[PDB]
Amino acid sequence: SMNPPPPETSNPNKPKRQTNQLQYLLRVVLKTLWKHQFAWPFQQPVDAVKLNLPDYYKIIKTPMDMGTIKKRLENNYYWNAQECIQDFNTMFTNCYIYNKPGDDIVLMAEALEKLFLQKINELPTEE
Ligand SMILES: CCN1C(=O)c2cccc3c(S(=O)(=O)N4CCCC4)ccc1c23
């Protein structure tokens, strides 16, 4: 039983920008989701060894999680808000792929995804 290396949070050869929207994605969007009662399963990479989900990384090949997202934001990893929104989308999609409608974890993800969409419906203007 082996977890893979977690996604990178720094990369010196990737272009980065400090954007008004990206600051909002950390200050408001991430930080708010993080405090939700259903946030905890998503706050770190899936440890398939601890959770005894040995088939997880047999199935999920582009893992993502809010802890990785938060580190990427704090580390100025992204060029634009769409890159970071894509990571959120990968996180939710992975959960929907591995699990089935009605599972507790899927109900948690559905609730978080709706809050996430509410929060990104309106982003600060790329002044
Ligand atoms: C979001 C990533 N991710 C999955 O795809 C997934 C599948 C089955 C269980 C779990 C757990 S758990 O065991 O702590 N759990 C919390 C609620 C249900 C059970 C935490 C995080 C998980 C899973």
> For a pocket test of ligand 1, which of 105, 112, 113, 116 has the largest count of ligand atoms closer than 8 A to its C-beta?
105
Residue 33 tokens read as: 């989701």
Phi-psi domain of 39 (left: phi exceeds 0; alpha: psi -120 through 50; beta: other): alpha
For residue 65, the enclosing domain spans 19-123
For ligand 1, atom 8, the nearest C-alpha belongs to 105
> Ligand 1 pocket, 42 CB below 6 A?
yes
Residue that is written with structure tokens 């010196």 in the block: 12
Query: What's the total number of domains in the chain?
Result: 1
Phi-psi domain of 91 (left: phi exceeds 0; alpha: psi -120 through 50; beta: other): alpha
Return d(Cα 118, Cα 114) in angstroms, integer.
6
Is 3 exposed, middle or buried (CB count within 10 Å of its CB: 0-12, 13-18, 19+)?
Answer: middle
In angstroms, this model's resolution equals: 1.8
* Residue 77: inside a domain: yes
CATH number where 61 lies = 1.20.920.10
**Distances 13 to 16, 78, 81 between C-alpha atoms, Å:** 9, 12, 19
For ligand 1, atom 22, the nearest C-alpha belongs to 41
* Residue 13: inside a domain: no
* Residue 90: inside a domain: yes
* Method underlying the structure: X-ray
* Residue 33: inside a domain: yes
**Distances 57 to 43, 61, 62, 81, 110 between C-alpha atoms, Å:** 17, 6, 9, 27, 22
* Residue 80: inside a domain: yes
